[PDB]
């Protein structure tokens, strides 16, 4: 890659600079180069990788939704024919989004996940794998939409199994995994009851474990519990 000649430490340093400059494409390229050095990632480095690509794909998903909405309006009764442009441009953004998701999934598969032995790293990467298959599922329509959905489910499920065995119920990675898996159930899998049940059980079991936490860990956990509560308020 284009980052093969830069030191690992310099790539990490520049990824942090790019975050401060809100240059998330750069940040993602720097962290991709850091991953491709072949060494495992620290807790902080995993967060940098995640933050970079979440911002990049977040912009693409927002644009895809704008364009998909315009496209759907143009294909309604009484709509004037505007030509292939809206579809073409939505396809362009969609293709770029799928390329980013494939890049992240390729990093996880080569070889972040297979070298991740600790629960903190393994659950983190498997949650990522579920997230980026979920983003692929959001735009999928063809022969493989069901397989993409099952790939997301399978990664989330393995992460859930490990987190329930190896992490306390207030662990922020465990909480964010359950939050996103519940969003998967609601938005992707057409299982709103499973989404609500998971969010409720996750919230209640975290609530009962808060007494064990320091002030700073309490703040971390209750922040994500509020996101679970926000979704439950929207879903019920």
């Amino acid at each position: 890659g284009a980052m093969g000649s830069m030191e690992r430490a310099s790539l990490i340093q520049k990824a942090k600079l790019a975050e401060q400059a809100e240059r998330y494409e750069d940040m993602a390229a720097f962290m991709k180069g850091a991953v491709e050095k072949g060494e495992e990632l620290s807790c902080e480095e995993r967060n940098l990788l995640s933050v970079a690509y979440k911002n990049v794909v977040g912009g693409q998903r927002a644009a895809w939704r704008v364009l998909s909405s315009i496209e759907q309006k143009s294909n309604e009764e009484g709509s004037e024919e505007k030509g292939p442009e809206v579809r073409e441009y939505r396809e362009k953004v969609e293709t770029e989004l799928q390329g980013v998701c494939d890049t992240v999934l390729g990093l996880l598969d080569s070889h972040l996940i297979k070298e991740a032995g600790d629960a903190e790293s393994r659950v983190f990467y498997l949650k990522m794998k579920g997230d980026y298959y979920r983003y692929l599922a959001e735009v999928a329509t063809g022969d493989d939409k069901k397989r993409i959905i099952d790939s997301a489910r399978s990664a989330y499920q393995e992460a859930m199994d490990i987190s329930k065995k190896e992490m306390p119920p207030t662990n922020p990675i465990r909480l964010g995994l359950a939050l996103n898996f519940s969003v998967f159930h609601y938005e992707i899998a057409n299982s709103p009851e499973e989404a609500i049940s998971l969010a409720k059980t996750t919230f209640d079991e975290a609530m009962a474990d808060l007494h064990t936490l320091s002030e700073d860990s309490y703040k971390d956990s209750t922040l994500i519990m509020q996101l679970l509560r926000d979704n439950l308020t929207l879903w019920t």
């Binding site: 975050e19 902080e44 940098l48 933050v51 979440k54 964010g176 969003v183 609601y186 979704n231």
Partner: peptide, 9 residues
């Protein structure tokens, strides 16, 4: 429905 925002380290 909100997933983890996860856009700030």
């Amino acid at each position: 429905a909100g997933s983890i925002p996860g856009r700030r380290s």
